[PDB]
Design a protein around this nucleic acid. Structure first.
Ligand SMILES: Nc1ncnc2c1ncn2[C@@H]1O[C@H](COP(=O)(O)OP(=O)(O)OP(=O)(O)O)[C@@H](O)[C@H]1O
Lengths: 210, 338, 263
DNA sequence: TGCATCCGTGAGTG
DNA sequence: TATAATGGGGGATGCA
RNA sequence: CUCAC
């Protein structure tokens, strides 16, 4: 009934009353220290749906990643606005990033073994321990690592560098380590005797990175 | 200003679930259900009450009411007591609470993310007696029913299973609310069967069917009479304000002045007979004819008000009438009173 | 884990876990808070800065937020959000009309009546006319909001059986049914804990029902019976108009002891 | 400039 | 109760 | 739609 008695009683427009009554805009009864777009929420202010979800439930955004394409960032990492998340995906805000569904789970299995390695005396540097990437020995000339046992070869390579397991029956008799700079001369499932070269070391050899 | 468009816009805000997210939410819901099922075992309380409290804390403080079915009245005080009794559990017992909260919170998003289906389902049930938004607000209840019954282990997408409950909600709502005269669902189904049958008969004959053709095409137990009666009870009442239609309709209930007159002249010319008779004579007649209680008391019951048996009462009655019959033809008042 | 016992990824031995190729990346504007011992807050709770989160009160919150407990990563999240109270419908309006102290508004409006600029005096005058109307009457503004809706007696909107055994009813009956079918539906949707969209839509439809019962066709479109473009006769259409109760049944009736003939 | 509200009486027929 | 289905179909006057 | 103004 123009002019709206209720509307004129609360300094509310016809549009405003239409929005509040018929569920088009939220009207605030208690800000509780809230702030929208820089300004603190004042009572009797008209919030929309987005303005209400942002203030009441916070803001967030899920970005689709192409099937197969991995993410540049990792899980639990803080992100800035405009910061890249994937080779083609850019984030539109700041905050904590979360991996939705990791299609591939890679498990780095911890292994602790014991292996032997023969090297010329003047060619090896004496250390009680060896960090990854650190030079284990420097050979002035091509030296061939030779088998000290006889049996079948179990070859087990890594990302860089490799192992070697000599065994009779299925019981292991020898475990040799071939660092970065030691090229194997045998294959998997090969019969070797005592004395024959299993690998060649040339130049500087060091521990692998892993 | 348009509820339809407004609701369509409000529905286009919640994104569509990926298969992974779908299975995630469903799984979380089921896990929540089981978690509450064990929490009730731990606390030794009531599953419905517990899940209702979890719902309460999940939705916030905006929604707090006593739920029909729960024994305790859900006020913030009580839910505070219960929530404090939920925080009073060991780490391996208090860990099911988080699963309950997760279950409800995932249930909400699951319902919200599958609301666009109800629209596309109820879009074709239009013009049945209920409006678009009513069919939507019933199909939504059907969806709510579909959530608490879904089993993700069966590898079926939630759409396939929800569709059933949505249709089941709509087709019930229409059959329960569309008529001014509410008809039991099965009867409505019968009437619909009549409609489709008669429609087929009309389509093949080249003319409209009779009651007999319908009754024949319906099967055994069906005769023309039952078809006619079924069509009689299937009638939809019409409006009085139809261009009014209710202005050409008399008021049969209330007595007119002519009616009120004679009824007030019948009682008058009758208590002229409570006189000429006596006090007890003009009372055996009142019980017998039902002037006092409205019901006719036999000469059996009547005997227990004067002591007399069923044959002094009879002579008590016939003395009244026969005397009243002689009081007639001398006053001759009651003749026309027909 | 998986559907069946098979296909399950079981750790062969000791090692660490890494995740690659995510389906998507959920960027949340929140604050993380890891824990060692039992957590005191459950997920979904509202939290202010400096509230006892987990580990017996050691780790806490920095900002206003919503609690999101992660048991997989074993971390309590806080999504930056306030406990703001903003409502809708004729409930918030009822509250705002209840919060009114008409005396104070009379004071204020009287204090603004001294300002020039033409229009201010006028608006203050009208508003103060409404305020003083409520003050003198003794009526409360919140009564402009309906909790309990009155129901007209049956005979004044009768369902009667006509001459041919058919039934004829008033238009108020279908409106009342339209009201109840949404009120009860709302009462079911509330008890069963429905999402906000559904409840909002239901309340909106309820309002659409009371605004069709009292004055059909006033706002938006008039509700019609299926199969006709005829608006149902509301309680406003009954009283007002040339066909209204006033001009048709109070200021001029049909009478007994009256005949008509060609002169 | 948009919206809401008014726009003569009694009577007959289907 | 479980293929999957996910966004509709004139005519003038008073008053804000 | 018709009668009277
Ligand atoms: N009383 C009547 N008797 C016969 N035909 C009528 C009558 N009223 C209307 N009609 C028919 O309807 C046509 C015009 O009707 P119109 O729509 O102008 O009346 P209406 O709008 O129904 O009147 P109201 O709104 O007062 O009921 C007439 O030309 C005539 O054919």
């Amino acid at each position: 009934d123009v002019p709206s008695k209720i509307g004129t009683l609360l300094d509310l427009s016809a549009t405003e009353l239409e929005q509040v009554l018929y569920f088009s805009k939220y009207i605030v009864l208690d800000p509780k220290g809230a702030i929208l777009n820089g300004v603190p929420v004042e009572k009797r202010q008209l919030l929309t749906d987005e303005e209400y979800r942002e203030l009441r439930y916070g803001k967030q955004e899920t970005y689709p990643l192409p099937p197969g394409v991995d993410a540049l960032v990792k899980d639990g990492e803080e992100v800035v606005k405009g910061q890249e998340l994937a080779p083609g995906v850019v984030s539109r805000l700041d905050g904590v990033a979360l991996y939705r569904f990791p299609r591939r789970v890679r498990v780095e299995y911890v292994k602790k073994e014991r292996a032997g390695l023969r090297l010329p005396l003047a060619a090896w540097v004496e250390k009680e321990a060896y960090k990854p990437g650190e030079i284990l020995a420097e050979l002035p000339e091509p030296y061939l690592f030779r088998a000290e046992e006889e049996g079948v070869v179990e070859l087990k390579e890594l990302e860089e560098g490799a192992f070697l397991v000599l065994r009779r029956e299925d019981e292991p008799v020898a475990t040799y380590f071939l660092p970065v700079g030691m090229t194997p001369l045998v294959v998997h499932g090969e019969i070797v005797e005592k004395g024959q070269p299993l690998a060649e070391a040339k130049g500087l050899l060091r521990m692998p990175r892993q | 200003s348009d509820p339809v468009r407004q609701y369509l816009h409000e529905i286009g805000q919640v994104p569509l679930l990926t298969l992974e997210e779908e299975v995630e939410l469903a799984r979380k819901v089921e896990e929540g259900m089981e978690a509450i099922k064990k929490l009730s075992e731990i606390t030794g309380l009531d599953p419905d009450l517990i899940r209702e409290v979890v719902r309460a804390k999940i939705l916030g403080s905006a929604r707090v009411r006593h739920i029909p079915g729960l024994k305790e009245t859900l006020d913030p005080k009580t839910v505070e007591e219960i929530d404090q009794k939920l925080k009073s559990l060991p780490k391996e017992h208090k860990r099911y609470l988080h699963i309950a909260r997760e279950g409800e919170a995932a249930r909400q998003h699951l319902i919200e993310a599958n609301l666009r289906l109800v629209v596309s389902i109820a879009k074709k049930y239009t013009g049945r007696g209920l409006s678009f938004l009513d069919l939507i607000q019933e199909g939504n209840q059907g969806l709510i029913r579909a959530v608490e019954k879904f089993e993700y282990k069966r590898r079926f997408k939630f759409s396939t299973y929800a569709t059933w409950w949505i249709r089941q909600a709509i087709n019930r709502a229409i059959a329960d609310q569309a008529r001014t005269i509410r008809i039991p669902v099965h009867m409505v189904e019968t009437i619909n069967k009549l409609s489709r049958t008669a429609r087929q008969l009309q389509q093949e004959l080249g003319r409209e069917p009779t009651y007999e053709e319908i009754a024949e095409a319906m099967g055994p137990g069906w005769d023309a009479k039952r078809v006619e009666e079924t069509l009689k009870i299937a009638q939809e009442p019409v409006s009085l304000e139809t261009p009014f239609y209710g202005d050409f309709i008399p008021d049969e209930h209330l007595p007119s002045p002519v009616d009120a007159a004679t009824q007030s002249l019948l009682s008058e010319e009758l208590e002229k007979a409570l006189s000429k008779l006596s006090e007890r004579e003009a009372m055996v007649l009142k019980l017998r004819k039902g002037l006092i209680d409205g019901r006719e008391h036999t000469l059996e019951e009547v005997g227990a008000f004067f002591g007399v048996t069923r044959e002094r009462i009879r002579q008590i009655e016939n003395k009244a009438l026969r005397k009243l019959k002689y009081h007639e033809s001398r006053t001759r008042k009651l003749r026309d009173f027909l | 884990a998986a559907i069946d016992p098979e296909e399950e990824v079981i750790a062969e031995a000791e090692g660490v876990v890494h995740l690659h190729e995510p389906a998507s990346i959920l960027v949340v504007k929140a604050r993380v808070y890891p824990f060692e011992d039992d957590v005191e807050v459950s997920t979904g709770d509202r939290v202010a800065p400096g509230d006892v989160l987990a580990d017996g009160g050691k780790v806490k919150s920095d900002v206003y937020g919503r609690v999101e407990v992660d048991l997989v990563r074993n971390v309590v999240r806080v999504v930056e959000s306030y406990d703001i109270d903003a409502r809708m419908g004729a409930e918030a309006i009822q509250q705002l009309l209840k919060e009114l102290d008409l005396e104070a508004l009379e004071k204020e409006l009287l204090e603004e009546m001294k300002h020039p600029s033409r229009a201010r005096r006028a608006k203050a005058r009208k508003r103060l006319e409404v305020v003083r109307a409520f003050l003198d009457s003794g009526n409360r503004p919140e009564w402009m909001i309906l909790e309990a809706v009155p129901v007209l007696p049956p005979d004044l909107r009768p369902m009667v059986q006509v001459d041919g055994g058919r039934f004829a009813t008033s238009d108020l009956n279908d409106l009342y049914r339209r009201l109840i079918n949404r009120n009860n539906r709302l009462k079911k949707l509330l008890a069963q804990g429905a999402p906000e969209i559904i409840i909002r839509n239901e309340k909106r439809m309820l309002q659409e029902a009371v605004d069709a019962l009292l004055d059909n066709g006033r706002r938006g479109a008039p509700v019609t019976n299926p199969g006709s473009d005829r608006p149902l006769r509301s309680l406003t259409d009954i009283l007002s108009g040339k066909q209204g109760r006033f001009r048709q049944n109070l200021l001029g009736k049909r009478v007994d002891y009256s005949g008509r003939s060609v002169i």
